[PDB]
Every structure is written in structure tokens, then in C-alpha cells.
Design an enzyme around this catalytic site. Structure first.
Site, short mmCIF file in Angstrom:
data_model
loop_
_atom_site.label_atom_id
_atom_site.label_comp_id
_atom_site.label_asym_id
_atom_site.label_seq_id
_atom_site.Cartn_x
_atom_site.Cartn_y
_atom_site.Cartn_z
N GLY A 63 58.62 -13.14 -34.71
CA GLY A 63 59.04 -14.43 -35.22
C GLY A 63 60.41 -14.78 -34.70
CG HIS A 100 59.16 -9.79 -26.50
ND1 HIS A 100 59.12 -11.02 -27.11
CD2 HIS A 100 58.84 -10.01 -25.20
CE1 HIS A 100 58.79 -11.95 -26.23
NE2 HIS A 100 58.60 -11.36 -25.06
CG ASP A 101 63.13 -10.20 -31.18
OD1 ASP A 101 62.13 -10.83 -30.73
OD2 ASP A 101 63.43 -10.26 -32.39
CG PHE A 147 62.55 -6.99 -35.34
CD1 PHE A 147 62.51 -5.98 -36.29
CD2 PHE A 147 63.77 -7.37 -34.81
CE1 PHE A 147 63.68 -5.33 -36.68
CE2 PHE A 147 64.95 -6.74 -35.21
CZ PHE A 147 64.90 -5.72 -36.15
N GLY A 186 64.17 -15.11 -34.21
CA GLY A 186 65.15 -14.07 -34.53
C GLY A 186 64.54 -12.76 -35.02
CG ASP A 230 56.80 -13.18 -21.96
OD1 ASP A 230 57.66 -12.90 -22.85
OD2 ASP A 230 56.72 -14.31 -21.45
C1 LIG Z 1 60.78 -16.85 -28.52
C2 LIG Z 1 61.28 -16.38 -29.88
C3 LIG Z 1 62.12 -15.12 -29.70
C4 LIG Z 1 62.89 -14.78 -30.94
O1 LIG Z 1 63.65 -15.57 -31.46
O2 LIG Z 1 62.77 -13.57 -31.50
C5 LIG Z 1 60.04 -16.16 -30.72
C6 LIG Z 1 59.74 -17.01 -31.77
C7 LIG Z 1 58.60 -16.81 -32.53
C8 LIG Z 1 57.74 -15.76 -32.24
C9 LIG Z 1 58.04 -14.91 -31.19
N1 LIG Z 1 57.22 -13.84 -30.81
C10 LIG Z 1 57.61 -12.52 -30.70
C11 LIG Z 1 58.94 -12.00 -31.01
N2 LIG Z 1 59.53 -11.14 -30.16
O3 LIG Z 1 59.50 -12.33 -32.05
C12 LIG Z 1 56.56 -11.78 -30.27
C13 LIG Z 1 55.46 -12.65 -30.09
C14 LIG Z 1 54.15 -12.45 -29.66
C15 LIG Z 1 53.30 -13.50 -29.57
C16 LIG Z 1 53.71 -14.78 -29.92
O4 LIG Z 1 52.81 -15.79 -29.82
C17 LIG Z 1 53.01 -16.99 -30.54
F1 LIG Z 1 51.83 -17.74 -30.46
F2 LIG Z 1 53.28 -16.71 -31.87
F3 LIG Z 1 54.06 -17.70 -29.96
C18 LIG Z 1 55.01 -15.02 -30.35
C19 LIG Z 1 55.90 -13.95 -30.43
C20 LIG Z 1 59.19 -15.12 -30.42
CA LIG Z 2 61.81 -12.07 -32.93
#
Ligand SMILES: C[C@H](CC(=O)O)c1cccc(-n2c(C(N)=O)cc3ccc(OC(F)(F)F)cc32)c1
Ligand SMILES: [Ca+2]
Ligand SMILES: C[C@H](CC(=O)O)c1cccc(-n2c(C(N)=O)cc3ccc(OC(F)(F)F)cc32)c1
Length: 122
Positions: free
Chosen positions: A28, A46-47, A26, A30, A91
Site C-alpha cells: 500500500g 519493494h518500498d 507495507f 507508504g 517490479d
Molecule cells: C507505488 C506505491 C509505493 C509506496 O508508496 O509504497 C504503492 C502504492 C500502493 C500499493 C503499492 N504496492 C506495493 C507496495 N510496495 O506497497 C506492492 C504492490 C503490488 C501490487 C500492486 O498492485 C496494485 F494493483 F495494487 F497497484 C500494488 C503494490 C505501491
Molecule cells: Ca508500500
């Protein structure tokens, strides 16, 4: 947006926000499957939070908001609208969730082919 996501996560927790760019199923772009560990569960939550904000008419990836880092804690505001408060809440929540975790290096760049098609509910 992503700028505040990085900032907030960095504020509260002990590690570079880079550490969550590709972790488990999760953390990253999606995500699907069974969350592998506590970190992955934080990312699942968080997603889900972001999905709710999109459903509320917000743009979680880009929309800017104001916040402060005080004693490794995120304080949200001031907000101009409801989307800013929703995004900061998402966040802040993930930043708090991740800060209480142990990092499992084995889920860094975990292969997507091991992640199941089905996911837990939001
Ligand atoms: C915004 C998008 C949500 C989507 O598609 O799912 C996404 C993309 C890549 C990573 C994340 N992402 C997530 C997450 N919920 O996947 C937690 C998290 C925490 C720190 C962080 O920092 C950084 F530097 F990697 F952007 C990035 C973080 C979110
Ligand atoms: Ca994600
Ligand atoms: C992933 C892990 C996070 C943990 O243990 O808490 C970790 C450990 C040591 C250094 C870093 N680390 C840092 C840092 N300041 O710690 C910056 C950075 C930049 C690229 C990079 O490589 C990769 F592949 F992870 F992007 C790795 C990077 C991350």
C-alpha cells in the site's frame, strides 16, 4: 509505474494485484512497522527498491517501461535509460517474491494503528 507494477505482479503470481493494495504494514501507499509475513516482507523490499530509484532520479509511480510476460515470468526491456531498467528490476523482484507466497487473508486491510512507528532497514 503503477501500470507495470500491476502487470508484472499479475504476470508471475496467482492472484489479482488488487490483493496487495492494502495488506499488512507495507503493501500500500507508504508503509512502516514490522513486516507481518512473507508478502509484507516482499512489499518492504519493494518500498526500499522504489526509495533507491527515487534517490537515483527516477519516478517509480509514473515512469513507463517495456517488458514481456513469458511463461509467468517477467522479462525486462527494451530500456531507453537507466530508470526504466531500475524500475523494471524492482517490479520483477516483487513479482517473483510474491509469487512464492501464501496469501494470509487476515492481513488484508490490516489496521495501520497496529503497525509500529519503526521499520526494518533497507
Ligand atoms: C507505488 C506505491 C509505493 C509506496 O508508496 O509504497 C504503492 C502504492 C500502493 C500499493 C503499492 N504496492 C506495493 C507496495 N510496495 O506497497 C506492492 C504492490 C503490488 C501490487 C500492486 O498492485 C496494485 F494493483 F495494487 F497497484 C500494488 C503494490 C505501491
Ligand atoms: Ca508500500
Ligand atoms: C484478496 C484475495 C486475494 C487472494 O486470495 O488471492 C481475493 C480473493 C478472492 C477474490 C479477490 N478479488 C478479485 C479476484 N479476481 O480474485 C478481484 C477483486 C476485486 C475486489 C475485491 O475486493 C477487495 F476488497 F479485495 F478489493 C476482491 C477481488 C481477491
Amino acid at each position: 509505474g503503477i501500470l507495470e507494477l500491476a502487470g508484472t505482479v499479475g504476470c508471475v503470481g496467482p492472484r489479482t494485484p488488487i490483493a496487495y493494495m492494502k495488506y499488512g504494514c507495507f503493501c500500500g501507499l507508504g508503509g512502516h512497522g514490522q513486516p507481518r509475513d512473507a508478502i509484507d516482507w516482499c512489499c518492504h523490499g519493494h518500498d526500499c527498491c522504489y526509495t533507491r530509484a527515487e534517490e537515483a532520479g527516477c519516478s517509480p509511480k509514473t515512469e513507463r517501461y517495456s517488458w514481456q510476460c513469458v511463461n509467468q515470468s517477467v522479462l525486462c526491456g527494451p530500456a531507453e535509460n537507466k530508470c526504466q531498467e531500475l524500475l523494471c528490476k524492482c517490479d520483477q523482484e516483487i513479482a517473483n517474491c510474491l509469487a512464492q507466497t501464501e496469501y494470509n487473508l487476515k492481513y488484508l486491510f490490516y489496521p495501520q494503528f497496529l503497525c509500529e512507528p519503526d521499520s526494518p532497514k533497507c
